[PDB]
From Swiss-Prot, chains A, B:
The protein's enzyme class: lyase
Any one GO BP annotation for this protein: glyoxal metabolic process
Biological source species: Schizosaccharomyces pombe (strain 972 / ATCC 24843) (Fission yeast)
Name of this protein: Glutathione-independent glyoxalase DJ-1
Keyword Cytoplasm belongs to the record: yes
Length: 190, 190
């Protein structure tokens, strides 16, 4: 299994770090893939952390090529980061390709959940940050006020406070119960 | 109030990001202060994120000088990073200086809680990652198995899963009721 954590200028640090750290603990390969202008892959996160992404998306020639490399695509939030990711055709194309495929998985958290709406995903239910609830429900989704929603192979989640639950939900789809439980235990979930 | 978030090579990404993002949302100044030898302040985190710290600890000549710059000192975990921070004389000296001051606060999370012990702090009750429980108890602390503990002006916490609750407990000490509740409600805590 092979994970892509998308990242842009303006991506939220908390929502990035939780899935990152969970998949690393699981010993599941994960790359950060930057969508932006910086030629050095230096990202200015939402709350001003400056981080190097592993890759630029420009390295990947198409969505079909992306699908040959990765099994899980994760779209974190933060207002600016989500605006950029959600309005990038490459990201949308990956999400559309992955949706309802066997052994592919999509995660979106906070304002990142707007990517379901822009890509035209036909899931019925969704969650996202309360600040984007109206926008989601505008798009015909039925909003669920719970930390995480799974429909088909799309995981959505609300905010920085639910980033750990979100990462875990993703991991749960792809890890054995044995591995899941071991990672879970190591986290000290409250 | 100004906050110092210590960071070392090997510091956990989740435990860094939670207090970082919480204080940023609170509009309370926060600096990352690197303990390590890279001269560009580039840090390799526990799970391989590469990111710049704002300052090196070498810029600050003594714990008494640190205390004129910062009101809250935070020691995150991650196995490696905690070992470095806990064994750095400057960090011990800062912890020892801030303890019981009426206008300062200390936070430690996961294996970073070992710093209480290496600093010789005389609080009676504490928590930390369950993997360092035995070490904490050998130091004469009573270990509480819960997400966050406060005693005097020391906040300790267990692991990546408790990082948000930890950052919130720190914020609670210094924010107005109005600013705590607003930041809390923005996080979408589960
Ligand atoms: Mg140079």
């Amino acid at each position: 299994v092979k994970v892509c954590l998308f990242v842009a200028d303006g991506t939220d640090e908390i929502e990035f770090s939780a899935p990152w750290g969970i998949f690393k603990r699981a010993e599941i390969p994960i790359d950060s893939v930057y969508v932006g202008e910086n030629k050095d892959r230096l990202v200015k996160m939402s709350r001003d952390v400056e981080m190097y992404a592993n890759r630029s998306y420009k390295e990947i020639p198409s969505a079909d090529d992306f699908a040959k490399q990765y099994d899980i695509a994760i779209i974190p939030g933060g207002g600016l980061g989500a605006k950029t990711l959600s309005t990038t055709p490459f990201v949308q194309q990956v999400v559309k390709e992955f949706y309802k495929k066997p052994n592919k998985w999509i995660g979106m958290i906070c304002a990142g959940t707007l990517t379901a709406k822009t890509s035209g995903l036909p899931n019925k239910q969704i969650t996202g940050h309360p600040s984007v609830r109206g926008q989601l429900e505008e798009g015909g989704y039925k909003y669920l006020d719970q930390p995480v929603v799974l429909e088909e192979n799309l995981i959505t989640s609300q905010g920085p406070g639910t980033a750990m639950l979100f990462g875990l939900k993703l991991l749960e789809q792809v890890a054995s119960k044995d591995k899941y439980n071991a990672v879970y235990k190591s986290l000290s979930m409250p």
